[PDB]
């Protein structure tokens, strides 16, 4: 159970970056979800 020290390359990273943006009104998605109605300053691009 190394759960105190997990891997540095981590899925958790992306969310925190995305999170800090909506703390400044740049993203109007409340649940921190990558959906279309983000806001006015930016524009989500789909990822395939």
């Amino acid at each position: 159970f190394e759960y105190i020290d997990p891997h540095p390359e981590d899925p958790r990273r992306i969310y925190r970056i995305y999170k800090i943006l909506a703390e400044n009104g740049l993203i109007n998605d409340p649940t921190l979800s990558g959906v279309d109605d983000l806001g006015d300053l930016m524009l989500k691009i789909p990822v395939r």
């Binding site: 159970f1 759960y3 789909p46 395939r48």
Partner: protein, 48 residues
């Protein structure tokens, strides 16, 4: 001393089951996210 030891033991037991719980949520998360991705691809060709 016995109080300290039993709190350690119950915490240990919780810690032991937590990992497998995480793994199960991960498994079923993959199961659903597969169908999420393919449905996204269907909506993509519809956009096209």
């Amino acid at each position: 001393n016995a109080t300290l030891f039993n709190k350690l033991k119950e915490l240990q037991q919780a810690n032991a089951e937590k990992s497998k719980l995480n793994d199960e949520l991960r498994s079923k998360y993959q199961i659903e996210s597969s169908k999420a991705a393919e449905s996204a691809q269907t909506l993509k060709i519809l956009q096209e």
